[PDB]
Amino acid sequence: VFHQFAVFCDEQLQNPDSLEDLARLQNLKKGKDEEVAQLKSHLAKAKQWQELDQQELRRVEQTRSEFLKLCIENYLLSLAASDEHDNDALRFMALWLEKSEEEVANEVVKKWINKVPTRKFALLMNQLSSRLQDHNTLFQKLLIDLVY
Amino acid sequence: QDAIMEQVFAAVSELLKLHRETRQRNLGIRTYKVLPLTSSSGLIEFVSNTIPLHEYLMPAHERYYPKDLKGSQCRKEIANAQTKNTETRIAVYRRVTERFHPVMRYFFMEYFPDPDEWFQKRTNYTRTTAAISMLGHVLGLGDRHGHNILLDHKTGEVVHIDLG
Ligand SMILES: Nc1ncnc2c1ncn2[C@@H]1O[C@H](COP(=O)(O)OP(=O)(O)OP(O)(O)=S)[C@@H](O)[C@H]1O
Numbered sequence A: 001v002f003h004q005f006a007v008f009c010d011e012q013l014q015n016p017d018s019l020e021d022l023a024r025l026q027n028l029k030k031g032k033d034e035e036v037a038q039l040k041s042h043l044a045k046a047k048q049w050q051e052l053d054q055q056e057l058r059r060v061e062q063t064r065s066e067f068l069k070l071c072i073e074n075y076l077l078s079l080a081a082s083d084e085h086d087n088d089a090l091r092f093m094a095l096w097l098e099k100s101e102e103e104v105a106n107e108v109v110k111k112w113i114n115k116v117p118t119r120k121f122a123l124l125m126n127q128l129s130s131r132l133q134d135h136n137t138l139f140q141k142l143l144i145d146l147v148y
Numbered sequence B: 001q002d003a004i005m006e007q008v009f010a011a012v013s014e015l016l017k018l019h020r021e022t023r024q025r026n027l028g029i030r031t032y033k034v035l036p037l038t039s040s041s042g043l044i045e046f047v048s049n050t051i052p053l054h055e056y057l058m059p060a061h062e063r064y065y066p067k068d069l070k071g072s073q074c075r076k077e078i079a080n081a082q083t084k085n086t087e088t089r090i091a092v093y094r095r096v097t098e099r100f101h102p103v104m105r106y107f108f109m110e111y112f113p114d115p116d117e118w119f120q121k122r123t124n125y126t127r128t129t130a131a132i133s134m135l136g137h138v139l140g141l142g143d144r145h146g147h148n149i150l151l152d153h154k155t156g157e158v159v160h161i162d163l164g
């Protein structure tokens, strides 16, 4: 069940349709902000439409953030449950290292990382020990503890 | 633009004739002729015995459902909620389509009362709609409102114009 749900959410993240939608909304926001920067009810309507674009973009990004949370959480739960799916460690690792800045990913990982057997990560020490740094971030406090 | 795209669509529909399944069903599109004279004028072929989809649908909606909203009332209710969040837009749209029922099935019952002719013409409608739907997806065709779609009331098929 957990692998099913994690693979679903992952596929919903790397969807070409949704990525093109996010890119289109981003270019729209950028161009509308530039147009507002030109003029500074013309300004009134322009900034009203800019605000509507902002609301749409917040909605889309919140959807993507929820998908990211569910993906990481269910990968970690699936690794801790059975041995059927063990290349989920490589996929979880790629997904977590891409999002080392987004603190939502780090909160989910902090919550669920201590229940996975460390034998699932044992063969990925070339990639884990290459990202070690002393920065006092949460990502580093999780990575150093996992390597330890 | 319209003439170039009409030519492109005609060429792809000619490609459709080389395959057993689309040729067996005569899947293709109906063409017309655009002739640009200058950068500001042209001659467009008026397709013979069609009727625009909107000109049939807006009178029929009030002829068959006198208690429903008019078409202009639905248009205005949808246009007023255009600068609002998506939740309010979807709620207004559901509210409007709960008081607006389709009437297209009568186009065939009032132009073809013979069941043999009726069945053949409704099949023509469905097939030409399917072909133009796939072909216009593949080529990104847009601007598909009710004034660009004509209903041929002799053969039952749809004609798409203004393909720019
Ligand atoms: N080639 C055509 N053959 C038959 N009917 C046509 C043809 N071109 C347009 N029409 C219809 O004749 C009417 C003339 O419309 P037009 O003035 O060409 O543009 P329009 O779509 O009606 O108006 P807008 O502002 O573009 S929505 C409309 O009802 C069209 O559906």
Ligand SMILES: [Mg+2]
Pocket (backbone or CB within 6 Å): B147, B148, B162
């Ligand atoms: Mg037109």
